[PDB]
Amino acid sequence: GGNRVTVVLGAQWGDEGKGKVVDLLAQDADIVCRCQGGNNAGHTVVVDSVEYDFHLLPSGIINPNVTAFIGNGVVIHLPGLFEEAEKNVQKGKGLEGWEKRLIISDRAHIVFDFHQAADGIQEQQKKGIGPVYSSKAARSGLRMCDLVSDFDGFSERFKVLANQYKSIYPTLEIDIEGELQKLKGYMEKIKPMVRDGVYFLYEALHGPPKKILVEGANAALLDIDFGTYPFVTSSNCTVGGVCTGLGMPPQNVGEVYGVVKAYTTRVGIGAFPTEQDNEIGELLQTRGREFGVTTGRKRRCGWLDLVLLKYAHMINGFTALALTKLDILDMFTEIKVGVAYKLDGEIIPHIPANQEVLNKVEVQYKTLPGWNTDISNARAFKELPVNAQNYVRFIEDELQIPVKWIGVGKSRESMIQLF
Amino acid sequence: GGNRVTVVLGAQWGDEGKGKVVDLLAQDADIVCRCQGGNNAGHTVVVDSVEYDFHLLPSGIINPNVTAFIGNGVVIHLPGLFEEAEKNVQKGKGLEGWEKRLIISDRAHIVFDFHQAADGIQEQQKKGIGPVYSSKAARSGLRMCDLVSDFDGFSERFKVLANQYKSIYPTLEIDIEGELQKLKGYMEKIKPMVRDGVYFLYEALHGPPKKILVEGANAALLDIDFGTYPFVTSSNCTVGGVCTGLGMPPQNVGEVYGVVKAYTTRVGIGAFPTEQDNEIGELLQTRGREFGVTTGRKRRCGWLDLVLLKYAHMINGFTALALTKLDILDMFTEIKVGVAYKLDGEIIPHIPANQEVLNKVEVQYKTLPGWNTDISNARAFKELPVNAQNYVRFIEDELQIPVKWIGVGKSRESMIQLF
Numbered sequence: 127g128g129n130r131v132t133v134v135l136g137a138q139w140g141d142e143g144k145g146k147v148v149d150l151l152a153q154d155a156d157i158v159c160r161c162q163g164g165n166n167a168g169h170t171v172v173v174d175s176v177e178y179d180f181h182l183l184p185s186g187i188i189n190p191n192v193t194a195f196i197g198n199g200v201v202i203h204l205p206g207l208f209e210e211a212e213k214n215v216q217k218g219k220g221l222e223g224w225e226k227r228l229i230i231s232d233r234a235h236i237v238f239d240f241h242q243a244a245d246g247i248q249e250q251q252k253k254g255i256g257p258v259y260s261s262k263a264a265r266s267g268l269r270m271c272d273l274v275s276d277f278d279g280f281s282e283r284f285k286v287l288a289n290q291y292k293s294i295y296p297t298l299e300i301d302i303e304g305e306l307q308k309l310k311g312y313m314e315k316i317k318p319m320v321r322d323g324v325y326f327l328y329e330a331l332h333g334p335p336k337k338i339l340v341e342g343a344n345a346a347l348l349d350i351d352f353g354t355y356p357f358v359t360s361s362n363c364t365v366g367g368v369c370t371g372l373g374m375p376p377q378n379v380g381e382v383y384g385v386v387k388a389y390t391t392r393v394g395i396g397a398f399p400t401e402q403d404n405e406i407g408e409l410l411q412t413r414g415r416e417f418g419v420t421t422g423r424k425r426r427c428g429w430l431d432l433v434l435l436k437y438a439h440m441i442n443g444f445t446a447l448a449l450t451k452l453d454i455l456d457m458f459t460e461i462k463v464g465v466a467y468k469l470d471g472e473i474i475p476h477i478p479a480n481q482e483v484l485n486k487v488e489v490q491y492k493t494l495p496g497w498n499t500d501i502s503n504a505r506a507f508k509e510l511p512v513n514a515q516n517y518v519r520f521i522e523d524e525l526q527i528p529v530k531w532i533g534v535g536k537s538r539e540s541m542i543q544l545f
Numbered sequence: 546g547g548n549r550v551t552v553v554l555g556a557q558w559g560d561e562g563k564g565k566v567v568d569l570l571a572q573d574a575d576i577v578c579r580c581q582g583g584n585n586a587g588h589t590v591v592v593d594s595v596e597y598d599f600h601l602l603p604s605g606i607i608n609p610n611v612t613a614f615i616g617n618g619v620v621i622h623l624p625g626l627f628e629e630a631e632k633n634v635q636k637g638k639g640l641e642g643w644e645k646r647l648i649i650s651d652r653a654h655i656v657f658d659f660h661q662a663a664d665g666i667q668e669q670q671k672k673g674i675g676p677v678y679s680s681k682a683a684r685s686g687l688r689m690c691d692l693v694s695d696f697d698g699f700s701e702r703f704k705v706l707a708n709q710y711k712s713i714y715p716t717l718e719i720d721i722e723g724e725l726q727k728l729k730g731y732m733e734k735i736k737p738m739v740r741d742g743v744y745f746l747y748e749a750l751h752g753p754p755k756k757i758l759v760e761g762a763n764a765a766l767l768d769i770d771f772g773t774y775p776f777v778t779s780s781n782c783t784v785g786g787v788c789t790g791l792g793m794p795p796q797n798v799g800e801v802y803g804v805v806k807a808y809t810t811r812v813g814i815g816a817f818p819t820e821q822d823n824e825i826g827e828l829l830q831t832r833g834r835e836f837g838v839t840t841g842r843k844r845r846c847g848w849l850d851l852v853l854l855k856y857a858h859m860i861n862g863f864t865a866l867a868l869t870k871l872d873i874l875d876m877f878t879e880i881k882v883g884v885a886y887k888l889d890g891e892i893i894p895h896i897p898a899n900q901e902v903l904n905k906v907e908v909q910y911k912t913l914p915g916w917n918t919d920i921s922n923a924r925a926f927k928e929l930p931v932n933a934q935n936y937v938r939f940i941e942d943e944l945q946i947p948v949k950w951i952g953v954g955k956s957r958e959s960m961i962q963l964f
């Protein structure tokens with residue numbers, strides 16, 4: 127019974143174009159949610175030329191009729207949150223009254239300045255994601271409910287945790303009193319936004335009809351359990367993280383959309399079976415503009431991998447796909463798709479869990495004919511050339527998951543919706 | 546599509562009688578699973594007088610027709626696992642051929658001796674649960690797939706992690722070479738049991754009809770996110786942990802049974818709104834034999850709390866309840882049940898997330914008449930006295946969840962199944 131949430135999840139290693147899909151769906155949502163992760167990825171939404179940037183906040187908050195909801199599974203750096211919101215207010219009127227439309231689950235953990243600093247030091251041996259999730263598991267971390275209740279109690283616990291980090295990282299510059307004093311100011315602005323998230327969501331699920339959207343962060347292959355460990359993030363980026371990060375049961379999960387780029391990218395090091403460190407990869411990188419916006423560094427590129435897609439589907443149970451950046455392939459005379467894995471000369475049915483073993487797999491490819499035409503103006507599936515249509519159908523046939531959206535360009539209008 | 550798993554979850558703070566329900570359901574299961582947690586709780590299953598004890602292993606493995614499955618969310622101390630299995634083999638023939646009927650997900654994390662040792666030290670400032678889940682989040686932990694692949698690689702990483710703990714805990718006695726040498730022996734016995742768990746489960750879900758049972762560990766109010774934090778365990782003991790700990794989607798979750806004791810217990814310190822630290826609590830403790838079997842220490846006891854039960858249901862979406870130890874109440878002339886919470890003189894709709902605030906709530910009670918008769922021989926709901934029937938109906942009416950089982954004694958036969 128009750129409303130069933132719509133979830134948008136990245137199917138690969140991020141940068142698939144989830145924001146493009148969320149943009150469309152958030153236009154008629156009532157509630158938009160974050161369930162897991164922190165603020166490590168930035169996205170830009172343009173309204174009347176004005177470029178707003180989101181990191182922790184659900185991009186859907188740009189719709190004036192939505193309530194944005196931060197779940198218990200999310201980790202929150204308070205200076206970062208206020209900086210992000212305040213900078214948006216400086217850019218234009220799009221976030222007018224945001225404080226009235228943001229609800230923060232009081233069970234969310236707080237990322238401290240020292241967690242971010244420790245993150246940098248550990249990397250030497252910087253959003254503080256590893257450290258805050260480690261403190262959470264250790265039960266030493268502090269939560270929003272602690273900050274907004276007895277500040278003496280909060281302060282005592284904060285000092286213990288800060289001193290732990292200081293004693294483990296002697297080179298760590300840690301301003302215990304200064305951080306704590308800024309938190310006093312941060313606590314007073316956040317208080318009205320902090321509430322019981324389990325009760326909030328339960329009431330929204332069981333009241334009148336509502337469209338509730340959950341914006342997944344990161345992607346399936348970056349999942350702490352299921353991704354290419356240890357080259358993963360520290361949270362569950364998969365569907366089960368919706369349930370654990372929002373405190374709602376499986377029967378309230380509705381549509382789960384997998385955002386699948388028409389070819390593959392990876393940002394960091396880590397196994398990448400279909401990687402094309404060559405002219406094919408250069409062509410993908412150039413046409414897909416595959417580089418960090420806040421770094422400039424090029425992403426590793428490769429062919430679509432349907433073996434890893436099927437794996438993400440085993441875990442996530444996608445109800446439909448959004449296949450993005452199909453237009454990148456407009457210049458390809460032939461396109462390869464990974465369809466099977468061999469290990470030591472033998473076909474294997476699984477994804478090797480160990481990184482070094484995954485590194486040894488030989489991908490078996492299907493070669494499909496290119497269309498060699500510009501599809502950027504296509505607005506319906508009938509307008510796509512046959513070989514582009516067949517590329518889409520091949521993915522549908524191999525995965526047995528229907529494609530609901532096809533991305534044919536950067537703009538909002540550059541999308542085909544099939545049903 | 547496919548098979549849908551049955552889940553048994555503790556609804557309160559543990560010791561509800563989950564093993565009693567699992568005993569019944571495991572008799573016709575094909576696959577029994579652990580999804581989260583480690584070996585911190587022991588249970589005894591009696592077959593032909595022989596007492597077998599389970600800690601990490603699913604108790605259902607006692608059925609010769611089952612395959613026991615350890616999911617990716619579980620944390621595994623290898624000496625403990627082999628000790629547990631080997632001791633059972635010493636007791637009798639009930640575990641004959643267990644190595645042929647145990648499958649271990651290769652994405653499960655390993656609990657090292659130094660994690661257990663650190664656990665003890667941290668408590669001074671001991672199953673190693675906190676430490677292993679902290680290493681998992683930090684991405685420094687090692688997994689079953691690492692152990693069974695390149696042992697040189699495994700050894701290198703093991704030494705880094707061991708040395709981290711040694712440098713943080715100077716008083717920690719850590720035998721790096723000795724642990725590693727025992728792991729060489731442990732690796733060779735475990736190798737045939739270790740496989741890709743995502744693929745294993747996916748095939749079992751989508752092949753012929755199968756009865757797949759998931760034995761939850763711990764309980765809802767001990768959940769890392771949802772429990773009385775920090776007085777919780779370090780894993781998700783709630784329904785979302787089935788999905789994250791087994792790598793299967795919400796559409797493959799079927800029946801989710803909440804095991805609810807007819808009154809409440811807590812083992813450790815932590816908020817306990819209906820606690821009866823008095824003659825009522827003593828009577829519950831005595832009749833329910835509420836003490837640790839491996840410690841002898843008495844559990845804190847209190848009235849049934851329907852406010853916290855409704856909260857666990859918001860998160861878990863129970864499809865039915867098993868109401869255990871109803872016979873304990875046979876001696877009570879009146880029984881109180883917590884039905885609402887007041888905070889600072891005002892009724893509140895939520896469960897305070899902060900422990901100290903939860904400590905301040907005043908429970909509002911409903912008083913129900915006792916039956917004052919021995920129900921231990923009852924085998925059908927019609928055989929229960931009216932006031933016992935009405936106690937059951939009150940819970941059903943308040944929670945709007947049907948009761949499927951009523952426990953009226955310790956034995957297998959001391960159960961009523963309503964549907």
Ligand SMILES: Nc1nc2c(ncn2[C@@H]2O[C@H](COP(=O)(O)OP(=O)(O)O)[C@@H](O)[C@H]2O)c(=O)[nH]1
Binds near residue numbers: 414450454533537
């Ligand atoms: N050419 C092209 N660019 C796209 C398409 N979809 C997304 N993009 C661009 O790719 C980048 C990444 O998309 P975004 O929505 O931010 O990805 P996210 O990090 O997964 O949310 C953005 O610059 C988008 O404008 C597409 O279908 N075609």
Ligand SMILES: Nc1nc2c(ncn2[C@@H]2O[C@H](COP(=O)(O)OP(=O)(O)O)[C@@H](O)[C@H]2O)c(=O)[nH]1
Binds near residue numbers: 560565869873951953
């Ligand atoms: N008198 C009585 N004892 C019960 C009942 N259900 C369980 N027990 C006992 O309570 C203890 C805890 O039950 P167990 O199944 O091990 O709990 P678990 O830790 O939640 O799995 C065991 O000694 C059981 O025999 C009941 O309905 N009545």
